[PDB]
């Protein structure tokens, strides 16, 4: 039997599992980045979080399934790991998968269970169609439990196909790139979700022109100067904190007067002649806190 | 029996490949087109996403025809996995007793150098995209790796080491894989910077506006706040200025594109209304922000 034979499966399985570690840190990375752009302006953020969230914990359940297994034929070949050309038996999995001809119900919950991942995935983006649906294709292609037929014309059964008569090790091999199928699944699903996100905050949609003029009092016919600046309008915008400091005094009578009920900071304060309205606008985006200026004046 | 599942894992890895290179062209194509709407924001993202674009494709057609010559010997069809298992003429055309021969230096050259200069263009080790070097390290490393001895294999060595030919095909379509999807990490990390940065608050200024302004006197104030768009970088694409319907504002003349704002100095006999429409072409589509106000001078 071919001594270089099923080395290379172990190979295989080291390179996925490395990589599989370092896409699971990454895609905590991105969690806690997408949880803390929910933390502030939730409303921005909230249906990217929580289908994200959902991806998540499909996914972990899948990976954490799959896991279980890899751990049962793991304790099968023995306390030897790092050792491959043992993983040659081929037996276990199929007693434990089907009966004779037909599925055993644990091999039919596995089955089911990667359905049903896709078919939740998939109606999660929005299958097939929508934004983002060449994803759905992805997802199809990785997960699809199509009963396949052989090159000699037999339809042979998915699983069946996909898993008997094979070494313990290449099994493992199989489910462990199914895992960083998960995971590739849920690095894509977070980078689409935040993009879209994020090109729904840039969309030129979101603004409005205004006039930035330094004065209004426009004498007889004088050449004249001014500008065109695209204000914000988008509700979904919300300063995560505000100071607002008057003619120095009264430092922002807290929504006493201002109403950030829309963009439009609304600000219902007081007055007595001429005046001007100072202070910082804090946002909090991506876990550092911004603040932008305010200096302006009024009669 | 005969390990058909290197030839099932080809299979898969090649059809994921495809899909992945497809979403990959669709992604550069949105990269050229943003950079054809506003050349100045993608300029950076779009030239580095297109070296990446070269080096990927450049190492992908490397290792695609090194699987070319491979599957050559394997007889007239291309699926009897089985068949494909004499694992003679690859090992023979890499290297000669312990030494590589001058091909195999250079294929681990051409690997070597692609992981060199990929990381040395997305900042390195340090700075930004970290993990993202820690997984294009991790995938591509030809560092002398110690087997279940104490012993270094060299790394074309034991990866390539009397493999049957279908192994070698699965572990170069594996190489592949890693190159796409280190090609969609790398594009959606560049334009995911890129949007977070046009989304940053330090692009903003505030602004006020009211209906009429001046009080002489103290009675109320209902004012509003908004953060008007002072990236340099942003800018419309078209600018139709028919303000009370003379003409289009000289569009040679007053409106000026060089920053953000449109420095508008036209004409004065009285008072004026500014209307007409901007045009900022996003993702293909057409947006048109609406610009209609007043300012009145007398004349």
Same mark, same amino acid.
């Given at each position: 039997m071919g001594k270089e034979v099923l080395s290379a499966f172990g190979l295989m399985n080291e390179k996925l599992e490395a990589s599989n570690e370092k896409a699971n840190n990454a895609n905590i990375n991105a969690i806690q980045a997408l949880e803390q752009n929910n933390a502030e302006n939730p409303d921005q953020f909230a249906e990217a979080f929580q289908k994200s969230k959902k991806v998540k914990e499909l996914s972990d359940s899948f990976y954490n399934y799959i896991e279980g297994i890899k751990g049962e034929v793991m304790n099968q070949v023995?306390?030897?790991?790092?050792?491959?050309?043992?993983?040659?038996?081929?037996?276990?999995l199929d007693q434990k998968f089907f009966v004779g001809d037909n599925y055993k119900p644990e091999g039919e919950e596995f089955v089911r269970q990667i359905n049903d991942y896709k078919t939740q995935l998939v109606e999660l983006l929005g299958g097939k169609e929508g934004t983002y649906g060449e994803l759905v294709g992805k997802i199809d292609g990785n997960f699809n439990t199509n009963d396949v037929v052989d090159r000699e014309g037999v339809t042979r059964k998915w699983l069946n196909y996909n898993f008997? $008569?094979?070494p313990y090790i290449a099994s493992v091999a199989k489910l462990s790139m199914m895992q960083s199928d998960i995971r590739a699944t849920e690095q894509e699903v977070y980078a689409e979700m935040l993009k879209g996100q994020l090109k729904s905050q840039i969309s030129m949609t979101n603004y409005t022109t205004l006039l930035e003029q330094?004065? $209004?009092?426009?004498?007889?016919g004088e050449s004249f100067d001014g500008a065109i600046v695209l204000g914000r309008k988008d509700a979904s915008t919300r300063p995560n904190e505000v100071e607002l400091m008057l003619d120095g005094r009264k430092l922002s009578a807290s929504e006493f007067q201002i109403e950030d009920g829309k963009v439009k900071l609304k600000v219902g304060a007081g007055n007595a002649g001429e005046h001007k309205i100072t202070g910082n606008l804090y946002f909090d985006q991506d876990g550092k806190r911004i603040a932008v200026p305010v200096s302006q004046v009024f009669s």
């Open positions: 023995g306390e030897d790991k790092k050792d491959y050309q043992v993983m040659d038996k081929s037996d276990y008997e $008569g094979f330094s004065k $209004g009092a426009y004498y007889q």
